[PDB]
Amino acid sequence: VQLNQYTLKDEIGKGSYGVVKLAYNENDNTYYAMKVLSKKPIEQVYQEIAILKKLDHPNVVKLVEVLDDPNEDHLYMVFELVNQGPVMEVPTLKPLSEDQARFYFQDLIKGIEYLHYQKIIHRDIKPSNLLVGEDGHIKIADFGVSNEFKGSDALLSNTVGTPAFMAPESLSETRKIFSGKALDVWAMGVTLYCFVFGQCPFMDERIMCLHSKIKSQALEFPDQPDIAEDLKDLITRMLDKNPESRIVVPEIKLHPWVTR
Numbered sequence: 001v002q003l004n005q006y007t008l009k010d011e012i013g014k015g016s017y018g019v020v021k022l023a024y025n026e027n028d029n030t031y032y033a034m035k036v037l038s039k040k041p042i043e044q045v046y047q048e049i050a051i052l053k054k055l056d057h058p059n060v061v062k063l064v065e066v067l068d069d070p071n072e073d074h075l076y077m078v079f080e081l082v083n084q085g086p087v088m089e090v091p092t093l094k095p096l097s098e099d100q101a102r103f104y105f106q107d108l109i110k111g112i113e114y115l116h117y118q119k120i121i122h123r124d125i126k127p128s129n130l131l132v133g134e135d136g137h138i139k140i141a142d143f144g145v146s147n148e149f150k151g152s153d154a155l156l157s158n159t160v161g162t163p164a165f166m167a168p169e170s171l172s173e174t175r176k177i178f179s180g181k182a183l184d185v186w187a188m189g190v191t192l193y194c195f196v197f198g199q200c201p202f203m204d205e206r207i208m209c210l211h212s213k214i215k216s217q218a219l220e221f222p223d224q225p226d227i228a229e230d231l232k233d234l235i236t237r238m239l240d241k242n243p244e245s246r247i248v249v250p251e252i253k254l255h256p257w258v259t260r
């Protein structure tokens with residue numbers, strides 16, 4: 001299976017809409033990550049390509065090129081390979097230590113700050129989208145449902161992303177408008193909870209009940225593992241159900257748990 005200079009190898013991950021395969025470039029003798037898409041909507045993908053083309057940051061995955069044939073049903077996005085894969089799998093019985101969670105969370109902060117400055121809402125922040133590169137640092141991946149905005153913030157109404165990480169204000173049943181940056185903060189909070197507990201803070205196999213818990217269940221910390229009180233404070237502020245009082249990224253950067 002060869003596509004121009006690339007030989008397609010085995011699957012390595014899930015992308016938004018498609019699959020991600022390891023790929024070998026015969027021109028430069030180098031492995032890449034290739035997202036394969038079958039046209040089944042397509043406007044969302046070219047916005048993703050358009051977003052990826054504008055981005056250049058150490059904590060954000062790089063799009064290398066796009067293989068688009070108006071003849072073939074398949075479309076190929078070639079990314080840099082982030083060789084060590086996701087930072088963790090959720091759920092797990094072996095979560096990160098606090099020191100590891102802080103190390104990775106610092107990369108997540110820098111990446112999100114950059115995305116928001118570039119006027120991008122990621123909308124699908126979660127551990128499986130935080131890939132560990134050759135030097136051990138995080139690269140944010142999967143911009144399949146991301147939004148670009150003008151001005152100070154996005155004003156959104158559509159519900160997209162991974163359900164366990166969706167912010168409560170995005171789950172109104174009345175097409176209400178909500179702002180974008182606070183959505184990424186909420187998902188960063190679910191992610192940090194995942195880092196140290198190995199499972200999501202709101203869980204239910206019934207999607208109605210999952211939504212109801214995100215919107216209405218008080219955050220609860222498990223007795224074990226016993227995490228520091230300032231980390232509990234930071235998670236609590238990021239998982240504030242009210243997006244208006246939810247901690248903002250400039251404050252996360254200063255939080256005493258982050259800076260120690």
Ligand SMILES: Cn1cc(/C=C2\C(=O)Nc3ccc(Cl)cc32)cn1
Nearest residue numbers: 012013033079081082083085141142
């Ligand atoms: C070792 N490993 C790599 C992956 C996946 C990816 C990778 O490397 N670059 C990517 C760029 C964009 C997307 Cl959406 C996914 C990946 C999974 N496991």
Ligand SMILES: [Cl-]
Nearest residue numbers: 090126127128
């Ligand atoms: Cl995940």
